[PDB]
Amino acid sequence: QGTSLLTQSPASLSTYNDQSVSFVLENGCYVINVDDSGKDQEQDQVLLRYYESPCPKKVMVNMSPIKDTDIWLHANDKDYSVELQRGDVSPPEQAFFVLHKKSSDFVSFECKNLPGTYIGVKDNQLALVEEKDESCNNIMFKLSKI
Amino acid sequence: GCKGILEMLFDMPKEERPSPMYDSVTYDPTPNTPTTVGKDGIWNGVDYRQGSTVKPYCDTGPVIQGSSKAVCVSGKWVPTLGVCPKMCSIGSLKENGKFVDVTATTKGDELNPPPREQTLIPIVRKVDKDKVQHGVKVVALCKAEGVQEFECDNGKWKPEPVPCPEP
Ligand SMILES: [Cl-]
């Protein structure tokens, strides 16, 4: 196989119930907040990095806040949490989720190494969740231009 | 290596970025590049591999004021990439020219075909059939010989419309 092309696009990331996934400085470092206060979502866009990977076919997607494109969403298997990691420590290959397309332009993000474990929403935060242990909409997000 | 196109843009304040913004940016590996992401891949988490080729895509039309593709050479993208153009309004042309009808004669995907990688992720976009991409051609009517051709050039119709006589 040849080397797959790599594409990047900005987008606004929101949940199924139309809550903003935003990024705020907390004690010096960015944390991920699920916000429903109606604030402007321009500064809280994400930079998507994605490519196709042959599957024995899969779309791998990496996500950075435009506020700091040197950090990205990462699945922490030792805490079962979603965190931001910087590229001077965390390897980039471990920073891509497997995209699953749902109905009505919604998508889900599956952990590459933890099959069946997805990005989900718990208590106005992003968490790792089991697909079977949740309703469909808990792991459903929407990427919107502008 | 070279810092990525979008990374460079989102380092500056919003007022300093080009408008509109690129819709997608695709990076082509050199034949010697083993992986897509990795220490020797197109992207290593810090920058993008030397000799990589970059091709921006604008849903507003083919890029203007620069090159359509660039290569990573000595930490810089050469030659200078073009920026996204502005779209033109069908209704604005119909109004300024007092035309009875305005019909597009070319599609935006002719000069500006979308990359295949744009179908990989559903990103919801606003649709406005009144807008046509940069470089799209239209024909306007006056309701003999009252047919005028126009081209969308970065938010402006060329040439200037001769307003139709009063019926
Ligand atoms: Cl950094």
Author numbering:
A (entry chain A): 111 to 166, 177 to 266
B (entry chain B): 64 to 206, 214 to 237
According to the publication:
While crystals containing full-length HpARI2 did not form, crystals were obtained containing the HpARI2_CCP2/3:IL-33 complex and we determined the structure to 2.1 Å. The asymmetric unit of the crystal contained one copy of each of HpARI2_CCP2/3 and mIL-33. The structure of HpARI2_CCP2/3 revealed that the two CCP domains, which are joined by a 3 residue-long linker, are not flexibly associated but instead interact with a buried surface area of 522 Å2. In particular, the 28 residue-long loop which connects strands β5-β6 of CCP3 extends ~28 Å away from CCP3 towards the base of CCP2. IL-33 interacts with both CCP domains of HpARI2_CCP2/3 with a total buried surface area of 1548 Å2. Most of the interaction occurs between the CCP2 domain and the rim of the mIL-33 β-barrel, with a total buried surface area of 1040 Å2 and with contacts involving the edges of β-sheets and interacting side chains. Residue R159 of IL-33 lies at the centre of this interface and the R159A mutation causes a ~ 1000-fold reduction in binding affinity for HpARI2_CCP2/3. All contacts between IL-33 and HpARI CCP3 are mediated by the long CCP3 loop. Interactions with IL-33 are mostly formed by non-polar residues from, and C-terminal to, a small helix which docks into a small concave, hydrophobic pocket on the top of the mIL-33 β-barrel.
The model gastrointestinal nematode Heligmosomoides polygyrus bakeri secretes the Alarmin Release Inhibitor HpARI2, an effector protein that suppresses protective immune responses and asthma in its host by inhibiting IL-33 signalling. A large loop which emerges from CCP3 directly contacts IL-33 and structural comparison shows that this overlaps with the binding site on IL-33 for its receptor, ST2, preventing formation of a signalling complex.
